[PDB]
């Protein structure tokens, strides 16, 4: 507190940490979704939800409490009978198309990362990226 708050030593991992740059020497960070245990758990939860959704009845109308103003005469069709059925179908199908969304997302991410050094200014303009792109084109 009173004295120098840094106290650099000859470790370079405490020295780098004390000045802010700690994770900046590792390739990729540490995350939670990278373990098979959490993956199995998430898959279990998703399968349970899909099971519950599929065990619903097909005839799943909804009484909307605003049908009062629509003077239904036992022959007309209520304009809101399919509102919980539509939501159930939407959730079920969205849960069944998860891998497709994952694939499209990873395609987008890869095709936007591969062009980082060409589309992002502060990466394209550093002397090191420019030097590397020049070094590749040496005839």
């Amino acid at each position: 507190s009173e004295k120098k708050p840094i106290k650099i030593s000859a470790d370079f991992n405490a020295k780098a940490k004390s000045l802010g740059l700690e994770s900046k020497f590792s390739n990729a960070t540490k995350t939670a979704l990278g373990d098979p245990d959490t993956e199995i758990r998430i898959s279990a939860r998703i399968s349970n939800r899909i099971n519950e959704l599929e065990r619903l009845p097909a005839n799943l109308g909804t009484y909307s409490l605003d049908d009062c103003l629509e003077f239904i005469t036992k022959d007309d069709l209520s304009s809101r009978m399919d509102t919980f059925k539509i939501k159930a179908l939407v959730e079920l199908k969205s849960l069944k198309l998860l891998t497709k969304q994952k694939s499209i997302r990873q395609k987008l991410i890869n095709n936007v990362a591969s062009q980082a050094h060409h589309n992002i200014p502060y990466l394209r303009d550093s002397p090191f990226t420019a030097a590397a792109q020049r070094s590749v084109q040496i005839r």
């Binding site: 708050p5 000045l19 802010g20 740059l21």
Partner: peptide, 20 residues
Amino acid sequence: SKLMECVNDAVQTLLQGDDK
């Protein structure tokens, strides 16, 4: 990494003055 923000602000204030 919060100390370096104060350090940068101090250096900028140094650049503001003349007889410093």
